[PDB]
DNA sequence: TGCGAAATTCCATGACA
DNA sequence: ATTGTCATGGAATTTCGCA
DNA sequence: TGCGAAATTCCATGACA
DNA sequence: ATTGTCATGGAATTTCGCA
């Protein structure tokens, strides 16, 4: 108010207003002459409706909002004060894009054996066939040793009658899943209890997470549009057949095909392998052995030039999963527990509920 | 000559009819003669149909050089031969009243209407649910002519389910007692 | 058949075959010790019948079609043979991605005057709203200035409705938009011709090419969502507010607002530029036919280092728009007829009709 | 003192009762004072809320620093003050029976009543489809004391639409006898 | 001990809602 | 309490056939 | 003729179905 | 017969205030 402005009109030196420009009253109302125009200096008791009425005509940003306010004002600093409200502002923090990139994707070791982690989901809804609608995809995380299963519904019902049959063959320790409805359900959890499986879930809303079973749903619609071009969608009767032909089809990168890196030799299917021919079977699984260990595997790619990686004690904001037409894109801020890796976090809402949650569903609050 | 191999041969067998269960009746037994793995699957009968339905399902996972049957009339008909052929899969019969396959495939057979006989006894209707665990028995059973089980010869690893239990297979003096009492 | 092979059994050099290897005769086929093992070499009058059995197993691409064959074959060239009949595969040609980027952007001229172009869009549907539904959004290209109208359905009865009520204002010389059913009519084009509007359209599924207002509808949504937090979403009665708040402005790499742009001048909305109060309308005038001149515009990014750019004659094939489930997501190949830059092209369907596309709904055919 | 400029001043009036035209009957008129630029709105009623709804759409694409207008009910209403005030501008109210303006408004007003009688001849009931075209023209005529249209004056570039054609606006003699039809 | 061509490996691109 | 993946087909690089 | 801090400019990021 | 755009907020760079 007053005070501080009382000084610099006198002559005398205040830090913050430079003293080789000439301060003024006018009108009632303290001035200065700066190289763009003359502009009002307001009691810095003003100053915070100032930035806040600047900000609201149109929830502008940093620059925009300064743009505005150079236009009738100045005083030590300005950028800081606009900040200050920005970084107190609801609407724009929930609703403003991040500009910030995710950190790099980490490349998960690769399962070390067949039957260590199965990865499970569904596709669908599919054009009617048989008067079934979905397909229950497993995928055996180490071979990619694929099997399918036709559904009427992505329910819990229909996962265990499925699995019940393939588990018949062997008994994974783990079990990977998004979170459906299927496989978050009470039932099937008793269900994996019950022999001894781990339910691991990926962060929610976060595809990615299920990656290894999502690019085999990408193989299979694309080789049953291939056998269904001009033809009604009857895939049904296909299912076997692409199950069939995707195990037995090579990875170029790895010079092998799920059904070798499961069994260690072609069953009877066309251009069996025929190379360890006259090893014993002992000798074959020995070599088996050997090559699932040397398999290539991708590394982390470099970062960004814009990343950020998560910190314990950060502001942080998660992504609203189906925001409704003309509502924000994000939640309230809420803060970073435990950092379990790069790309994963523990975050307590303002409920707070204990949420585990992918940095891609996440962005820094801005303005600290 | 060259080393025996999974995929080699199948061994398949009908077994029933049984008390229903869900609806089915018969268990068609597929056996791998190099490994001894087993298959089980559920029929309603012991037809060309639903041999042919149920070896679907396991030729979509690995297909055999040669399967080896007797000659029950689901594995003569000319439909299954016509099937075998589209698979490029030989037929192999034993001859009539003799049959054969190999002490590994006779033991592991007589293995199965073991198990299965020992547990139709309480609950002989409920036979369906258990054959995921029958078989996981079977095929993590230890092999006293190799040192090793069926699981760990297809797959080449040991399995999550080790039955450490070489278990009594025998009926005990209640279950040979309430065994006659569902026949006489 | 029988000939080629017959002058290689004997021990004569046939071109293709190596020398340094032992070629014979055995269970009444052609073989050859090759490091890998010993290999069957068809007769070339069976060769096209191999590949395609190895390729339709599960259709596919170059080296996994490669790696069936060479289990039980070999041949001079295979690779050849392979991608020959990758090129007739229909199937595979239109179901299969691409995996060549477009090349990088255009960035069109700024148009040198307010009213030389608008681009006009919709946005909805929306909660409803006292009736309506919609909002036709009008972006003048120079000026950036915009115009919002409610509608109750993304009709042309609608647009000319609301553009008649505009073009009161000025009639520009352009109007640019997608290929709705609103603006495609033979009524709006009367409409247009009727006041000697050119009309220009986008080339169709492609929003980039109407991205000055559909940049500008991220902005309306945007602060509309901001001012309905917590509220109802009762937008109606502040699109007026919106319009009035968005035309005023800073855009930071301008520093103009598009109201500034129009009319080089403020009107009494708050923190109104008091910098030309002494310069007379016509140095006002002056002053501003410079700033528009001067303003600052991007320019083609770097190509992605596997970028394509089309050639008259190519075949390429259109990105199906609105494929079905279990659909090829691509036509057909078609032939570039001419280039009209290089980010569009004219393209005969083998229709066959001319036809307008943008790059990036296309892909150059796999294979010549 | 400082020059003239576009929002510096609406002058703002009424025109009416017209003929029914798709429910309208009078035409609010603003003009810009630096510019001579016209906007016209349809009403109902000379009211103050027929006044506020048409000026919100106005003072969404520009705020005037001052409104101008004869003493009419609908500018002197207590709301209508309101209105302003939340808006910032200034009322400005000529004194009653004494209307003044500029000689530039007072010509263009002349205009736009010289130019709505000569169309509303013939078709008394279809003025509501030629706001649009009357706009256009009052808005690219070029001003004998200024070398520009106003058009130009508020854009600072000349018009897609010149009306090269400085037209009659005078009734010819057929429009004299059929005007004096309609009364008479 | 080096050439031209073939084979193999590399890897950006895009798609699993 | 968890985490991207991998077929694809031009281009880049390596290996082959020969000398 | 050079320092520390403030101001301004740069520009990757993401979103307009 | 056509064609991406531009608000945003940290970081990089430039300019200011002073000497
Ligand atoms: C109702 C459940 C629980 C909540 O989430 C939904 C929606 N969802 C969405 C996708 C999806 O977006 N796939 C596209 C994709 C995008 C990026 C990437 F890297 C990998 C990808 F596969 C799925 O695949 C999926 O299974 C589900 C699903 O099951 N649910
Ligand atoms: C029925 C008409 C005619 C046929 O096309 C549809 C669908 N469509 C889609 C989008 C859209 O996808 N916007 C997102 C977007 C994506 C990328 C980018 F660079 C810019 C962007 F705005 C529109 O904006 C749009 O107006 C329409 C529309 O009008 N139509
Ligand atoms: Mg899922
Ligand atoms: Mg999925
Ligand atoms: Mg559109
Ligand atoms: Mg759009
Ligand atoms: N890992
Ligand atoms: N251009
Ligand atoms: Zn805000
Ligand atoms: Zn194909």
Not at chain 1, 169 to 177: D, L, M, N
């Amino acid at each position: 108010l007053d005070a501080e402005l009382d000084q610099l009109l006198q002559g005398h030196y205040i830090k913050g207003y430079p003293k080789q420009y000439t301060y003024f009253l006018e009108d009632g109302k303290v001035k200065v002459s700066r190289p763009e125009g003359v502009k009002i200096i307001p009691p810095q008791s003003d100053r915070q409706k100032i930035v806040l009425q600047a900000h609201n005509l149109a929830h502008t940003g940093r620059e925009a909002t300064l743009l505005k306010i150079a236009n009738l004002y100045w005083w030590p600093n300005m950028r800081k004060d606009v900040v200050k409200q920005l970084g107190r502002c609801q609407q724009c923090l929930i609703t403003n894009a991040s500009n910030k990139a995710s950190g790099p994707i980490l490349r998960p070791d690769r399962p070390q054996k067949p039957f260590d982690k199965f990865f499970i989901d569904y596709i669908g809804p599919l054009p009617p066939s048989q008067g079934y609608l979905y397909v229950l995809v497993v995928v055996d995380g180490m071979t990619g040793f694929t099997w399918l299963y036709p559904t009427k519904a992505p329910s819990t019902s229909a996962t265990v009658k499925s699995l019940n049959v393939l588990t018949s063959i062997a008994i994974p320790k783990v079990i990977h899943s998004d979170q459906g409805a299927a496989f978050t359900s009470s039932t099937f959890a008793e269900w994996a209890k019950e022999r001894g499986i781990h339910l691991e879930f990926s962060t929610p809303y976060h595809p990615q997470s299920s990656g290894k079973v999502e690019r085999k749903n990408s193989d299979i619609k694309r080789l049953l549009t291939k056998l269904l071009v001009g033809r009604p969608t009857k895939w049904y009767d296909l299912l076997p057949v692409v199950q069939l032909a995707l195990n037995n089809t090579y990875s170029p990168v790895l010079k092998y095909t799920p059904h070798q890196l499961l069994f260690g030799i072609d069953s009877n299917t066309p251009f069996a392998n025929q190379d360890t021919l006259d090893l014993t079977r002992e000798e074959e699984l020995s070599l088996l052995q050997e090559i699932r260990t040397s398999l290539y595997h991708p590394s982390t790619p470099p970062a960004s030039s814009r990343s950020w990686s998560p910190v314990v004690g950060q502001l942080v904001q998660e992504r609203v999963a189906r925001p409704a037409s003309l509502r924000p894109r994000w939640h309230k801020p809420s803060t970073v527990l435990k950092v379990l890796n790069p790309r994963t976090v523990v975050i307590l809402d303002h409920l707070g509920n204990n949420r585990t949650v992918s940095i891609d569903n996440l962005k820094p609050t801005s303005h600290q | 000559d060259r080393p025996q191999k999974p995929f080699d041969k199948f061994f398949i067998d009908y077994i029933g009819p049984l008390p229903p269960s869900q609806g089915y009746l018969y268990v068609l037994v597929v056996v791998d003669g190099m490994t001894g793995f087993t298959w089980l699957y559920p029929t309603k009968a012991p037809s060309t149909s639903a041999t042919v339905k149920s070896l679907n399902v396991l030729t979509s996972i690995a297909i055999p050089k040669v399967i080896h049957s007797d000659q029950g009339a689901a594995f003569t008909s000319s439909t299954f031969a016509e099937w075998a052929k589209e698979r490029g899969i030989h037929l192999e019969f034993s001859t009539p009243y003799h049959p054969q396959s190999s002490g590994k495939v006779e033991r592991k057979n007589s293995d199965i209407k073991r198990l299965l006989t020992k547990l139709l006894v309480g609950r002989p209707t409920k036979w369906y649910d258990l054959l995921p665990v029958v078989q996981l028995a079977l095929n993590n059973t230890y092999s006293p002519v190799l040192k090793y089980t069926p699981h760990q010869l297809l797959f080449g690893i040991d399995s999550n389910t080790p039955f450490a239990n070489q278990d009594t297979l025998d009926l005990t003096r209640e279950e040979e007692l309430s065994l006659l009492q569902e026949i006489r």
